[PDB]
Amino acid sequence: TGLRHRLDKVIDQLAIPALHTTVQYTGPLSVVDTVLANHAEAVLREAVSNAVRHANATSLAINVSVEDDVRVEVVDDGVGISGDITESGLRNLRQRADDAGGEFTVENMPTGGTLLRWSAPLRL
Amino acid sequence: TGLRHRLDKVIDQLAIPALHTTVQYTGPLSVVDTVLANHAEAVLREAVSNAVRHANATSLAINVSVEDDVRVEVVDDGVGISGDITESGLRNLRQRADDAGGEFTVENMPTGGTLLRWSAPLR
Ligand SMILES: [Cl-]
Ligand SMILES: [Cl-]
């Protein structure tokens, strides 16, 4: 079952007329493999469920795309004494992610070291 | 203008010779516009400075790429604490992002509502 079909089943189950709902798919969704498609499904289910539950909401906009991003990933074998990033370091990369329409994660890895990932779409 | 060698300057001023460093550039980095190139440079600088400040670090692996990601974006104009930002909400997002080798952000938007974005590479 294609990714789009799977995500639309989730939307069909959860969307309600009280939130005016728009869904836009762009890009080659058909090439997404089953494991990744499954993760996207789980995420959308959470995001749509929580939107519908969000007090006094009147609208819901869903955009799912496969598109070129820039990605910066940095892995080191150390861990920061005071957290995975300084306060103003988190602020900076988070603000840039927000500005770029992208996403940012930093973590102390389950079995040692630090991972940082930052991605944003090539276009807007 | 040349993005690979520009990001090398960031790495060279911080990582070398302090850390055993690997660097990979994948995809058409020449198509990255000036604004996004500036973000990538600033992110790398922060990420590399952070790694170098870790007392027990000996090694560093850098990957900068242009490649296809799946992106799921969901925006609503509801009020109060979104389910997305609760302990269990964030846990599920973080787990899936980690499993997929991706990333996510949840914003409460100052002007009202909640934005969620989750992305991960196709490969
Ligand atoms: Cl599809
Ligand atoms: Cl190129």
JSON list of C-alpha atoms and ligand atoms in Angstrom, two decimals:
[
{"chain": "A", "resi": 1, "resn": "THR", "atom": "CA", "xyz": [0.00, 0.00, 0.00]},
{"chain": "A", "resi": 2, "resn": "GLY", "atom": "CA", "xyz": [1.46, 3.37, -1.12]},
{"chain": "A", "resi": 3, "resn": "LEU", "atom": "CA", "xyz": [2.43, 6.00, 1.46]},
{"chain": "A", "resi": 4, "resn": "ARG", "atom": "CA", "xyz": [-0.20, 8.53, 0.37]},
{"chain": "A", "resi": 5, "resn": "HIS", "atom": "CA", "xyz": [-3.04, 5.94, 0.66]},
{"chain": "A", "resi": 6, "resn": "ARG", "atom": "CA", "xyz": [-1.81, 4.97, 4.16]},
{"chain": "A", "resi": 7, "resn": "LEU", "atom": "CA", "xyz": [-1.66, 8.54, 5.42]},
{"chain": "A", "resi": 8, "resn": "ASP", "atom": "CA", "xyz": [-5.07, 9.33, 3.94]},
{"chain": "A", "resi": 9, "resn": "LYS", "atom": "CA", "xyz": [-6.57, 6.37, 5.82]},
{"chain": "A", "resi": 10, "resn": "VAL", "atom": "CA", "xyz": [-5.24, 7.97, 9.04]},
{"chain": "A", "resi": 11, "resn": "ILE", "atom": "CA", "xyz": [-6.69, 11.34, 8.02]},
{"chain": "A", "resi": 12, "resn": "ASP", "atom": "CA", "xyz": [-10.04, 9.78, 7.08]},
{"chain": "A", "resi": 13, "resn": "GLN", "atom": "CA", "xyz": [-10.21, 8.07, 10.52]},
{"chain": "A", "resi": 14, "resn": "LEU", "atom": "CA", "xyz": [-9.32, 11.17, 12.54]},
{"chain": "A", "resi": 15, "resn": "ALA", "atom": "CA", "xyz": [-10.30, 14.36, 10.70]},
{"chain": "A", "resi": 16, "resn": "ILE", "atom": "CA", "xyz": [-13.63, 15.89, 11.65]},
{"chain": "A", "resi": 17, "resn": "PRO", "atom": "CA", "xyz": [-15.58, 18.78, 10.07]},
{"chain": "A", "resi": 18, "resn": "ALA", "atom": "CA", "xyz": [-14.99, 21.06, 13.14]},
{"chain": "A", "resi": 19, "resn": "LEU", "atom": "CA", "xyz": [-11.41, 21.65, 12.02]},
{"chain": "A", "resi": 20, "resn": "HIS", "atom": "CA", "xyz": [-11.30, 22.77, 8.43]},
{"chain": "A", "resi": 21, "resn": "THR", "atom": "CA", "xyz": [-8.75, 20.37, 6.96]},
{"chain": "A", "resi": 22, "resn": "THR", "atom": "CA", "xyz": [-6.39, 20.67, 3.99]},
{"chain": "A", "resi": 23, "resn": "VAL", "atom": "CA", "xyz": [-3.89, 17.94, 2.99]},
{"chain": "A", "resi": 24, "resn": "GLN", "atom": "CA", "xyz": [-1.27, 18.46, 0.28]},
{"chain": "A", "resi": 25, "resn": "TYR", "atom": "CA", "xyz": [1.02, 15.76, -1.06]},
{"chain": "A", "resi": 26, "resn": "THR", "atom": "CA", "xyz": [3.98, 16.64, -3.29]},
{"chain": "A", "resi": 27, "resn": "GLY", "atom": "CA", "xyz": [7.00, 14.73, -4.52]},
{"chain": "A", "resi": 28, "resn": "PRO", "atom": "CA", "xyz": [7.67, 11.01, -5.20]},
{"chain": "A", "resi": 29, "resn": "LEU", "atom": "CA", "xyz": [5.90, 9.52, -2.16]},
{"chain": "A", "resi": 30, "resn": "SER", "atom": "CA", "xyz": [5.68, 6.23, -4.06]},
{"chain": "A", "resi": 31, "resn": "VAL", "atom": "CA", "xyz": [9.41, 5.65, -3.55]},
{"chain": "A", "resi": 32, "resn": "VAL", "atom": "CA", "xyz": [9.29, 5.74, 0.28]},
{"chain": "A", "resi": 33, "resn": "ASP", "atom": "CA", "xyz": [10.09, 2.25, 1.63]},
{"chain": "A", "resi": 34, "resn": "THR", "atom": "CA", "xyz": [7.81, 0.33, 4.02]},
{"chain": "A", "resi": 35, "resn": "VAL", "atom": "CA", "xyz": [9.73, 0.95, 7.24]},
{"chain": "A", "resi": 36, "resn": "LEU", "atom": "CA", "xyz": [9.99, 4.73, 6.66]},
{"chain": "A", "resi": 37, "resn": "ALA", "atom": "CA", "xyz": [6.33, 4.86, 5.49]},
{"chain": "A", "resi": 38, "resn": "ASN", "atom": "CA", "xyz": [5.42, 3.15, 8.75]},
{"chain": "A", "resi": 39, "resn": "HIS", "atom": "CA", "xyz": [7.28, 5.77, 10.80]},
{"chain": "A", "resi": 40, "resn": "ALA", "atom": "CA", "xyz": [5.60, 8.62, 8.85]},
{"chain": "A", "resi": 41, "resn": "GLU", "atom": "CA", "xyz": [2.19, 7.00, 9.52]},
{"chain": "A", "resi": 42, "resn": "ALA", "atom": "CA", "xyz": [2.84, 6.74, 13.26]},
{"chain": "A", "resi": 43, "resn": "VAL", "atom": "CA", "xyz": [3.98, 10.39, 13.34]},
{"chain": "A", "resi": 44, "resn": "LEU", "atom": "CA", "xyz": [0.98, 11.68, 11.35]},
{"chain": "A", "resi": 45, "resn": "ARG", "atom": "CA", "xyz": [-1.41, 9.70, 13.52]},
{"chain": "A", "resi": 46, "resn": "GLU", "atom": "CA", "xyz": [0.07, 11.40, 16.59]},
{"chain": "A", "resi": 47, "resn": "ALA", "atom": "CA", "xyz": [0.11, 14.87, 15.02]},
{"chain": "A", "resi": 48, "resn": "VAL", "atom": "CA", "xyz": [-3.45, 14.68, 13.63]},
{"chain": "A", "resi": 49, "resn": "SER", "atom": "CA", "xyz": [-4.88, 13.13, 16.85]},
{"chain": "A", "resi": 50, "resn": "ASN", "atom": "CA", "xyz": [-3.32, 15.89, 18.92]},
{"chain": "A", "resi": 51, "resn": "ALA", "atom": "CA", "xyz": [-4.52, 18.61, 16.49]},
{"chain": "A", "resi": 52, "resn": "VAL", "atom": "CA", "xyz": [-8.14, 17.37, 16.68]},
{"chain": "A", "resi": 53, "resn": "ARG", "atom": "CA", "xyz": [-7.83, 17.28, 20.51]},
{"chain": "A", "resi": 54, "resn": "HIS", "atom": "CA", "xyz": [-6.35, 20.80, 20.64]},
{"chain": "A", "resi": 55, "resn": "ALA", "atom": "CA", "xyz": [-8.86, 23.12, 22.40]},
{"chain": "A", "resi": 56, "resn": "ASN", "atom": "CA", "xyz": [-10.93, 25.38, 20.12]},
{"chain": "A", "resi": 57, "resn": "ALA", "atom": "CA", "xyz": [-9.02, 24.55, 16.90]},
{"chain": "A", "resi": 58, "resn": "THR", "atom": "CA", "xyz": [-10.75, 25.63, 13.71]},
{"chain": "A", "resi": 59, "resn": "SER", "atom": "CA", "xyz": [-8.17, 24.49, 11.13]},
{"chain": "A", "resi": 60, "resn": "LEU", "atom": "CA", "xyz": [-5.68, 21.79, 10.33]},
{"chain": "A", "resi": 61, "resn": "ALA", "atom": "CA", "xyz": [-3.15, 21.99, 7.50]},
{"chain": "A", "resi": 62, "resn": "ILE", "atom": "CA", "xyz": [-1.19, 18.85, 6.64]},
{"chain": "A", "resi": 63, "resn": "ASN", "atom": "CA", "xyz": [1.71, 18.87, 4.16]},
{"chain": "A", "resi": 64, "resn": "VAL", "atom": "CA", "xyz": [3.52, 15.67, 3.32]},
{"chain": "A", "resi": 65, "resn": "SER", "atom": "CA", "xyz": [6.32, 15.82, 0.77]},
{"chain": "A", "resi": 66, "resn": "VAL", "atom": "CA", "xyz": [9.38, 14.02, -0.54]},
{"chain": "A", "resi": 67, "resn": "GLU", "atom": "CA", "xyz": [11.79, 16.76, -1.52]},
{"chain": "A", "resi": 68, "resn": "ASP", "atom": "CA", "xyz": [15.48, 17.73, -1.50]},
{"chain": "A", "resi": 69, "resn": "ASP", "atom": "CA", "xyz": [16.75, 18.96, 1.85]},
{"chain": "A", "resi": 70, "resn": "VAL", "atom": "CA", "xyz": [20.11, 20.19, 3.01]},
{"chain": "A", "resi": 71, "resn": "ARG", "atom": "CA", "xyz": [21.24, 18.01, 5.93]},
{"chain": "A", "resi": 72, "resn": "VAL", "atom": "CA", "xyz": [24.02, 18.62, 8.43]},
{"chain": "A", "resi": 73, "resn": "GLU", "atom": "CA", "xyz": [24.88, 15.71, 10.68]},
{"chain": "A", "resi": 74, "resn": "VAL", "atom": "CA", "xyz": [27.64, 15.73, 13.27]},
{"chain": "A", "resi": 75, "resn": "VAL", "atom": "CA", "xyz": [28.52, 12.77, 15.50]},
{"chain": "A", "resi": 76, "resn": "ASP", "atom": "CA", "xyz": [31.19, 12.74, 18.16]},
{"chain": "A", "resi": 77, "resn": "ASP", "atom": "CA", "xyz": [32.23, 10.22, 20.80]},
{"chain": "A", "resi": 78, "resn": "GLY", "atom": "CA", "xyz": [32.03, 12.73, 23.70]},
{"chain": "A", "resi": 79, "resn": "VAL", "atom": "CA", "xyz": [29.08, 14.01, 25.79]},
{"chain": "A", "resi": 80, "resn": "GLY", "atom": "CA", "xyz": [28.68, 17.56, 27.19]},
{"chain": "A", "resi": 81, "resn": "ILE", "atom": "CA", "xyz": [28.94, 17.88, 31.02]},
{"chain": "A", "resi": 82, "resn": "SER", "atom": "CA", "xyz": [26.14, 20.50, 31.04]},
{"chain": "A", "resi": 83, "resn": "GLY", "atom": "CA", "xyz": [23.79, 19.00, 28.45]},
{"chain": "A", "resi": 84, "resn": "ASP", "atom": "CA", "xyz": [23.77, 18.00, 24.79]},
{"chain": "A", "resi": 85, "resn": "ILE", "atom": "CA", "xyz": [24.10, 21.71, 23.83]},
{"chain": "A", "resi": 86, "resn": "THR", "atom": "CA", "xyz": [24.39, 25.09, 25.59]},
{"chain": "A", "resi": 87, "resn": "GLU", "atom": "CA", "xyz": [21.16, 27.06, 26.06]},
{"chain": "A", "resi": 88, "resn": "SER", "atom": "CA", "xyz": [22.15, 29.72, 23.46]},
{"chain": "A", "resi": 89, "resn": "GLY", "atom": "CA", "xyz": [23.46, 27.00, 21.12]},
{"chain": "A", "resi": 90, "resn": "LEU", "atom": "CA", "xyz": [20.04, 25.28, 21.17]},
{"chain": "A", "resi": 91, "resn": "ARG", "atom": "CA", "xyz": [18.35, 28.66, 20.63]},
{"chain": "A", "resi": 92, "resn": "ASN", "atom": "CA", "xyz": [20.53, 29.44, 17.61]},
{"chain": "A", "resi": 93, "resn": "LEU", "atom": "CA", "xyz": [20.05, 26.19, 15.71]},
{"chain": "A", "resi": 94, "resn": "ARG", "atom": "CA", "xyz": [16.36, 25.99, 16.69]},
{"chain": "A", "resi": 95, "resn": "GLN", "atom": "CA", "xyz": [15.72, 29.54, 15.47]},
{"chain": "A", "resi": 96, "resn": "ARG", "atom": "CA", "xyz": [17.54, 28.74, 12.19]},
{"chain": "A", "resi": 97, "resn": "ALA", "atom": "CA", "xyz": [15.53, 25.54, 11.75]},
{"chain": "A", "resi": 98, "resn": "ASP", "atom": "CA", "xyz": [12.36, 27.62, 12.29]},
{"chain": "A", "resi": 99, "resn": "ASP", "atom": "CA", "xyz": [13.58, 30.26, 9.80]},
{"chain": "A", "resi": 100, "resn": "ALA", "atom": "CA", "xyz": [14.53, 27.60, 7.21]},
{"chain": "A", "resi": 101, "resn": "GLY", "atom": "CA", "xyz": [11.26, 25.71, 7.62]},
{"chain": "A", "resi": 102, "resn": "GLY", "atom": "CA", "xyz": [13.36, 22.80, 8.89]},
{"chain": "A", "resi": 103, "resn": "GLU", "atom": "CA", "xyz": [14.02, 20.63, 11.90]},
{"chain": "A", "resi": 104, "resn": "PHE", "atom": "CA", "xyz": [16.78, 20.11, 14.38]},
{"chain": "A", "resi": 105, "resn": "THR", "atom": "CA", "xyz": [17.60, 17.38, 16.92]},
{"chain": "A", "resi": 106, "resn": "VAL", "atom": "CA", "xyz": [20.52, 16.98, 19.33]},
{"chain": "A", "resi": 107, "resn": "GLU", "atom": "CA", "xyz": [20.92, 14.05, 21.63]},
{"chain": "A", "resi": 108, "resn": "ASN", "atom": "CA", "xyz": [23.16, 12.10, 23.91]},
{"chain": "A", "resi": 109, "resn": "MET", "atom": "CA", "xyz": [23.27, 8.75, 22.13]},
{"chain": "A", "resi": 110, "resn": "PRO", "atom": "CA", "xyz": [21.89, 5.66, 23.95]},
{"chain": "A", "resi": 111, "resn": "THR", "atom": "CA", "xyz": [25.33, 4.01, 24.17]},
{"chain": "A", "resi": 112, "resn": "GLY", "atom": "CA", "xyz": [27.80, 6.96, 24.17]},
{"chain": "A", "resi": 113, "resn": "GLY", "atom": "CA", "xyz": [28.58, 10.10, 22.19]},
{"chain": "A", "resi": 114, "resn": "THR", "atom": "CA", "xyz": [26.57, 12.99, 20.80]},
{"chain": "A", "resi": 115, "resn": "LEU", "atom": "CA", "xyz": [24.49, 13.21, 17.66]},
{"chain": "A", "resi": 116, "resn": "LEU", "atom": "CA", "xyz": [23.32, 16.43, 16.01]},
{"chain": "A", "resi": 117, "resn": "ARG", "atom": "CA", "xyz": [21.09, 16.65, 12.93]},
{"chain": "A", "resi": 118, "resn": "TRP", "atom": "CA", "xyz": [19.73, 19.65, 11.14]},
{"chain": "A", "resi": 119, "resn": "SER", "atom": "CA", "xyz": [17.75, 19.65, 7.90]},
{"chain": "A", "resi": 120, "resn": "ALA", "atom": "CA", "xyz": [15.76, 22.14, 5.86]},
{"chain": "A", "resi": 121, "resn": "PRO", "atom": "CA", "xyz": [14.17, 22.14, 2.42]},
{"chain": "A", "resi": 122, "resn": "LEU", "atom": "CA", "xyz": [16.09, 23.53, -0.55]},
{"chain": "A", "resi": 123, "resn": "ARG", "atom": "CA", "xyz": [13.09, 25.60, -1.50]},
{"chain": "A", "resi": 124, "resn": "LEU", "atom": "CA", "xyz": [11.32, 27.83, 1.07]},
{"chain": "B", "resi": 1, "resn": "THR", "atom": "CA", "xyz": [30.61, 29.99, -5.28]},
{"chain": "B", "resi": 2, "resn": "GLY", "atom": "CA", "xyz": [31.56, 26.62, -3.68]},
{"chain": "B", "resi": 3, "resn": "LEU", "atom": "CA", "xyz": [29.94, 25.21, -0.54]},
{"chain": "B", "resi": 4, "resn": "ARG", "atom": "CA", "xyz": [32.21, 22.22, 0.23]},
{"chain": "B", "resi": 5, "resn": "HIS", "atom": "CA", "xyz": [35.40, 24.27, 0.65]},
{"chain": "B", "resi": 6, "resn": "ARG", "atom": "CA", "xyz": [33.53, 26.96, 2.55]},
{"chain": "B", "resi": 7, "resn": "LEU", "atom": "CA", "xyz": [32.31, 24.38, 5.11]},
{"chain": "B", "resi": 8, "resn": "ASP", "atom": "CA", "xyz": [35.89, 23.03, 5.26]},
{"chain": "B", "resi": 9, "resn": "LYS", "atom": "CA", "xyz": [37.04, 26.39, 6.71]},
{"chain": "B", "resi": 10, "resn": "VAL", "atom": "CA", "xyz": [34.59, 25.94, 9.59]},
{"chain": "B", "resi": 11, "resn": "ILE", "atom": "CA", "xyz": [35.90, 22.44, 10.25]},
{"chain": "B", "resi": 12, "resn": "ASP", "atom": "CA", "xyz": [39.57, 23.42, 9.85]},
{"chain": "B", "resi": 13, "resn": "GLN", "atom": "CA", "xyz": [39.41, 26.22, 12.39]},
{"chain": "B", "resi": 14, "resn": "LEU", "atom": "CA", "xyz": [37.89, 24.04, 15.12]},
{"chain": "B", "resi": 15, "resn": "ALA", "atom": "CA", "xyz": [38.34, 20.30, 14.62]},
{"chain": "B", "resi": 16, "resn": "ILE", "atom": "CA", "xyz": [41.89, 20.01, 13.31]},
{"chain": "B", "resi": 17, "resn": "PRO", "atom": "CA", "xyz": [44.14, 18.67, 14.84]},
{"chain": "B", "resi": 18, "resn": "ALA", "atom": "CA", "xyz": [42.10, 18.28, 18.08]},
{"chain": "B", "resi": 19, "resn": "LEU", "atom": "CA", "xyz": [39.87, 15.45, 16.79]},
{"chain": "B", "resi": 20, "resn": "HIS", "atom": "CA", "xyz": [40.21, 12.45, 14.47]},
{"chain": "B", "resi": 21, "resn": "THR", "atom": "CA", "xyz": [37.79, 13.74, 11.86]},
{"chain": "B", "resi": 22, "resn": "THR", "atom": "CA", "xyz": [35.93, 12.22, 8.88]},
{"chain": "B", "resi": 23, "resn": "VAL", "atom": "CA", "xyz": [34.01, 14.42, 6.47]},
{"chain": "B", "resi": 24, "resn": "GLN", "atom": "CA", "xyz": [31.53, 13.44, 3.79]},
{"chain": "B", "resi": 25, "resn": "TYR", "atom": "CA", "xyz": [29.74, 15.67, 1.24]},
{"chain": "B", "resi": 26, "resn": "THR", "atom": "CA", "xyz": [26.91, 13.96, -0.64]},
{"chain": "B", "resi": 27, "resn": "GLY", "atom": "CA", "xyz": [24.64, 15.38, -3.36]},
{"chain": "B", "resi": 28, "resn": "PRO", "atom": "CA", "xyz": [24.50, 18.62, -5.38]},
{"chain": "B", "resi": 29, "resn": "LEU", "atom": "CA", "xyz": [25.77, 21.08, -2.79]},
{"chain": "B", "resi": 30, "resn": "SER", "atom": "CA", "xyz": [26.26, 23.65, -5.60]},
{"chain": "B", "resi": 31, "resn": "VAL", "atom": "CA", "xyz": [22.44, 24.16, -5.83]},
{"chain": "B", "resi": 32, "resn": "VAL", "atom": "CA", "xyz": [22.11, 25.31, -2.17]},
{"chain": "B", "resi": 33, "resn": "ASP", "atom": "CA", "xyz": [21.10, 29.04, -2.19]},
{"chain": "B", "resi": 34, "resn": "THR", "atom": "CA", "xyz": [22.92, 31.73, -0.17]},
{"chain": "B", "resi": 35, "resn": "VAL", "atom": "CA", "xyz": [20.45, 31.85, 2.74]},
{"chain": "B", "resi": 36, "resn": "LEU", "atom": "CA", "xyz": [20.50, 28.06, 3.27]},
{"chain": "B", "resi": 37, "resn": "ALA", "atom": "CA", "xyz": [24.30, 27.93, 2.76]},
{"chain": "B", "resi": 38, "resn": "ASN", "atom": "CA", "xyz": [24.59, 30.53, 5.55]},
{"chain": "B", "resi": 39, "resn": "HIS", "atom": "CA", "xyz": [22.42, 28.43, 7.84]},
{"chain": "B", "resi": 40, "resn": "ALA", "atom": "CA", "xyz": [24.40, 25.26, 7.09]},
{"chain": "B", "resi": 41, "resn": "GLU", "atom": "CA", "xyz": [27.68, 27.06, 7.87]},
{"chain": "B", "resi": 42, "resn": "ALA", "atom": "CA", "xyz": [26.35, 28.43, 11.20]},
{"chain": "B", "resi": 43, "resn": "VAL", "atom": "CA", "xyz": [24.90, 25.02, 12.21]},
{"chain": "B", "resi": 44, "resn": "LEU", "atom": "CA", "xyz": [28.19, 23.24, 11.43]},
{"chain": "B", "resi": 45, "resn": "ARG", "atom": "CA", "xyz": [30.17, 25.84, 13.40]},
{"chain": "B", "resi": 46, "resn": "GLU", "atom": "CA", "xyz": [27.96, 25.37, 16.47]},
{"chain": "B", "resi": 47, "resn": "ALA", "atom": "CA", "xyz": [27.89, 21.55, 16.13]},
{"chain": "B", "resi": 48, "resn": "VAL", "atom": "CA", "xyz": [31.64, 21.31, 15.71]},
{"chain": "B", "resi": 49, "resn": "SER", "atom": "CA", "xyz": [32.39, 23.75, 18.56]},
{"chain": "B", "resi": 50, "resn": "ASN", "atom": "CA", "xyz": [30.10, 21.71, 20.77]},
{"chain": "B", "resi": 51, "resn": "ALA", "atom": "CA", "xyz": [31.83, 18.41, 19.94]},
{"chain": "B", "resi": 52, "resn": "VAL", "atom": "CA", "xyz": [35.28, 19.92, 20.60]},
{"chain": "B", "resi": 53, "resn": "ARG", "atom": "CA", "xyz": [34.13, 21.09, 24.05]},
{"chain": "B", "resi": 54, "resn": "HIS", "atom": "CA", "xyz": [33.29, 17.49, 25.09]},
{"chain": "B", "resi": 55, "resn": "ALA", "atom": "CA", "xyz": [36.11, 16.46, 27.45]},
{"chain": "B", "resi": 56, "resn": "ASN", "atom": "CA", "xyz": [36.26, 12.81, 26.41]},
{"chain": "B", "resi": 57, "resn": "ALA", "atom": "CA", "xyz": [35.93, 13.31, 22.61]},
{"chain": "B", "resi": 58, "resn": "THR", "atom": "CA", "xyz": [38.65, 11.93, 20.35]},
{"chain": "B", "resi": 59, "resn": "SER", "atom": "CA", "xyz": [36.72, 11.56, 17.06]},
{"chain": "B", "resi": 60, "resn": "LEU", "atom": "CA", "xyz": [34.25, 13.42, 14.90]},
{"chain": "B", "resi": 61, "resn": "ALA", "atom": "CA", "xyz": [32.19, 12.42, 11.88]},
{"chain": "B", "resi": 62, "resn": "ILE", "atom": "CA", "xyz": [30.66, 15.11, 9.65]},
{"chain": "B", "resi": 63, "resn": "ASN", "atom": "CA", "xyz": [28.10, 14.51, 6.92]},
{"chain": "B", "resi": 64, "resn": "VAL", "atom": "CA", "xyz": [26.67, 17.38, 4.89]},
{"chain": "B", "resi": 65, "resn": "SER", "atom": "CA", "xyz": [24.36, 16.46, 2.06]},
{"chain": "B", "resi": 66, "resn": "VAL", "atom": "CA", "xyz": [21.62, 17.43, -0.33]},
{"chain": "B", "resi": 67, "resn": "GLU", "atom": "CA", "xyz": [19.22, 14.50, -0.64]},
{"chain": "B", "resi": 68, "resn": "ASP", "atom": "CA", "xyz": [15.54, 13.57, -0.68]},
{"chain": "B", "resi": 69, "resn": "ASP", "atom": "CA", "xyz": [13.77, 13.48, 2.68]},
{"chain": "B", "resi": 70, "resn": "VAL", "atom": "CA", "xyz": [10.21, 12.66, 3.58]},
{"chain": "B", "resi": 71, "resn": "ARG", "atom": "CA", "xyz": [8.70, 15.60, 5.52]},
{"chain": "B", "resi": 72, "resn": "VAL", "atom": "CA", "xyz": [5.46, 15.57, 7.53]},
{"chain": "B", "resi": 73, "resn": "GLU", "atom": "CA", "xyz": [4.18, 18.96, 8.56]},
{"chain": "B", "resi": 74, "resn": "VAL", "atom": "CA", "xyz": [1.01, 19.52, 10.61]},
{"chain": "B", "resi": 75, "resn": "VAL", "atom": "CA", "xyz": [-0.28, 22.94, 11.77]},
{"chain": "B", "resi": 76, "resn": "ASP", "atom": "CA", "xyz": [-3.34, 23.71, 13.87]},
{"chain": "B", "resi": 77, "resn": "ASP", "atom": "CA", "xyz": [-4.69, 26.90, 15.48]},
{"chain": "B", "resi": 78, "resn": "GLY", "atom": "CA", "xyz": [-5.81, 25.29, 18.78]},
{"chain": "B", "resi": 79, "resn": "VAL", "atom": "CA", "xyz": [-5.03, 26.74, 22.23]},
{"chain": "B", "resi": 80, "resn": "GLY", "atom": "CA", "xyz": [-3.35, 25.37, 25.40]},
{"chain": "B", "resi": 81, "resn": "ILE", "atom": "CA", "xyz": [-0.73, 22.61, 25.72]},
{"chain": "B", "resi": 82, "resn": "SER", "atom": "CA", "xyz": [-0.64, 20.54, 22.50]},
{"chain": "B", "resi": 83, "resn": "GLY", "atom": "CA", "xyz": [-0.51, 16.80, 22.93]},
{"chain": "B", "resi": 84, "resn": "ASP", "atom": "CA", "xyz": [2.65, 16.99, 20.77]},
{"chain": "B", "resi": 85, "resn": "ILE", "atom": "CA", "xyz": [4.68, 18.64, 23.51]},
{"chain": "B", "resi": 86, "resn": "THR", "atom": "CA", "xyz": [3.75, 16.36, 26.44]},
{"chain": "B", "resi": 87, "resn": "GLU", "atom": "CA", "xyz": [6.28, 13.80, 27.75]},
{"chain": "B", "resi": 88, "resn": "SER", "atom": "CA", "xyz": [4.62, 10.95, 25.83]},
{"chain": "B", "resi": 89, "resn": "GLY", "atom": "CA", "xyz": [4.02, 13.13, 22.73]},
{"chain": "B", "resi": 90, "resn": "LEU", "atom": "CA", "xyz": [7.71, 14.06, 22.48]},
{"chain": "B", "resi": 91, "resn": "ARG", "atom": "CA", "xyz": [8.80, 10.51, 23.33]},
{"chain": "B", "resi": 92, "resn": "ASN", "atom": "CA", "xyz": [6.95, 9.01, 20.33]},
{"chain": "B", "resi": 93, "resn": "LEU", "atom": "CA", "xyz": [8.33, 11.70, 17.97]},
{"chain": "B", "resi": 94, "resn": "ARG", "atom": "CA", "xyz": [11.89, 11.34, 19.29]},
{"chain": "B", "resi": 95, "resn": "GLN", "atom": "CA", "xyz": [11.78, 7.54, 19.05]},
{"chain": "B", "resi": 96, "resn": "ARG", "atom": "CA", "xyz": [10.55, 7.56, 15.42]},
{"chain": "B", "resi": 97, "resn": "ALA", "atom": "CA", "xyz": [12.98, 10.31, 14.46]},
{"chain": "B", "resi": 98, "resn": "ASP", "atom": "CA", "xyz": [15.86, 8.28, 15.99]},
{"chain": "B", "resi": 99, "resn": "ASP", "atom": "CA", "xyz": [14.69, 5.07, 14.33]},
{"chain": "B", "resi": 100, "resn": "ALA", "atom": "CA", "xyz": [14.45, 6.82, 10.94]},
{"chain": "B", "resi": 101, "resn": "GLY", "atom": "CA", "xyz": [17.76, 8.72, 11.26]},
{"chain": "B", "resi": 102, "resn": "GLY", "atom": "CA", "xyz": [15.73, 11.92, 11.13]},
{"chain": "B", "resi": 103, "resn": "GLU", "atom": "CA", "xyz": [14.70, 14.92, 13.18]},
{"chain": "B", "resi": 104, "resn": "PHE", "atom": "CA", "xyz": [11.63, 16.91, 14.27]},
{"chain": "B", "resi": 105, "resn": "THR", "atom": "CA", "xyz": [10.52, 20.15, 15.84]},
{"chain": "B", "resi": 106, "resn": "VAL", "atom": "CA", "xyz": [7.39, 21.19, 17.65]},
{"chain": "B", "resi": 107, "resn": "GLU", "atom": "CA", "xyz": [6.71, 24.96, 17.92]},
{"chain": "B", "resi": 108, "resn": "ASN", "atom": "CA", "xyz": [3.94, 26.70, 19.80]},
{"chain": "B", "resi": 109, "resn": "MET", "atom": "CA", "xyz": [3.42, 29.57, 17.39]},
{"chain": "B", "resi": 110, "resn": "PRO", "atom": "CA", "xyz": [3.38, 32.99, 19.13]},
{"chain": "B", "resi": 111, "resn": "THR", "atom": "CA", "xyz": [0.36, 34.04, 17.05]},
{"chain": "B", "resi": 112, "resn": "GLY", "atom": "CA", "xyz": [-1.67, 30.97, 18.07]},
{"chain": "B", "resi": 113, "resn": "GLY", "atom": "CA", "xyz": [-1.49, 27.21, 17.51]},
{"chain": "B", "resi": 114, "resn": "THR", "atom": "CA", "xyz": [1.01, 24.41, 17.07]},
{"chain": "B", "resi": 115, "resn": "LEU", "atom": "CA", "xyz": [3.37, 23.51, 14.24]},
{"chain": "B", "resi": 116, "resn": "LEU", "atom": "CA", "xyz": [4.90, 20.05, 13.99]},
{"chain": "B", "resi": 117, "resn": "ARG", "atom": "CA", "xyz": [7.49, 19.05, 11.45]},
{"chain": "B", "resi": 118, "resn": "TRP", "atom": "CA", "xyz": [9.12, 15.62, 11.23]},
{"chain": "B", "resi": 119, "resn": "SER", "atom": "CA", "xyz": [11.58, 14.59, 8.49]},
{"chain": "B", "resi": 120, "resn": "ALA", "atom": "CA", "xyz": [13.89, 11.72, 7.70]},
{"chain": "B", "resi": 121, "resn": "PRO", "atom": "CA", "xyz": [16.07, 10.72, 4.74]},
{"chain": "B", "resi": 122, "resn": "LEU", "atom": "CA", "xyz": [14.80, 8.18, 2.15]},
{"chain": "B", "resi": 123, "resn": "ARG", "atom": "CA", "xyz": [18.23, 6.50, 2.40]},
{"chain": "C", "resi": 1, "resn": "CL", "atom": "CL", "xyz": [2.41, 6.90, -2.54]},
{"chain": "C", "resi": 2, "resn": "CL", "atom": "CL", "xyz": [27.23, 19.98, -7.19]}
]
